[PDB]
Amino acid sequence: RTLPDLLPLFKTFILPLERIVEGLNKSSICDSKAMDSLQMGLNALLILRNLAQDTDSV
Amino acid sequence: SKVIVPQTVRLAEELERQQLLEKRKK
Numbered sequence: 422r423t424l425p426d427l428l429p430l431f432k433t434f435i436l437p438l439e440r441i442v443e444g445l446n447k448s449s450i451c452d453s454k455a456m457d458s459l460q461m462g463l464n465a466l467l468i469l470r471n472l473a474q475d476t477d478s479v
Numbered sequence: 480s481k482v483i484v485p486q487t488v489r490l491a492e493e494l495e496r497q498q499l500l501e502k503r504k505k
């Protein structure tokens with residue numbers, strides 16, 4: 422709340438995670454850029470959850 | 480660490496229980 426336009430960045434890091442997870446039923450993390458995008462998505466998701474533990478953020 | 484009992488959840492629980500108790504009083 423105090424910092425608006427913070428959630429859009431996390432969404433930009435989180436939606437490619439949706440695409441990856443859809444593509445996760447086979448070996449598809451061959452490259453290091455794929456691994457980096459996946460890890461960035463996981464970190465943004467954990468940040469979102471930790472913030473959602475509060476009333477204004479949720 | 481997870482917050483087991485949020486404020487809004489507790490408030491809504493109390494409100495609903497009081498509403499149903501008042502309905503039973505009728």
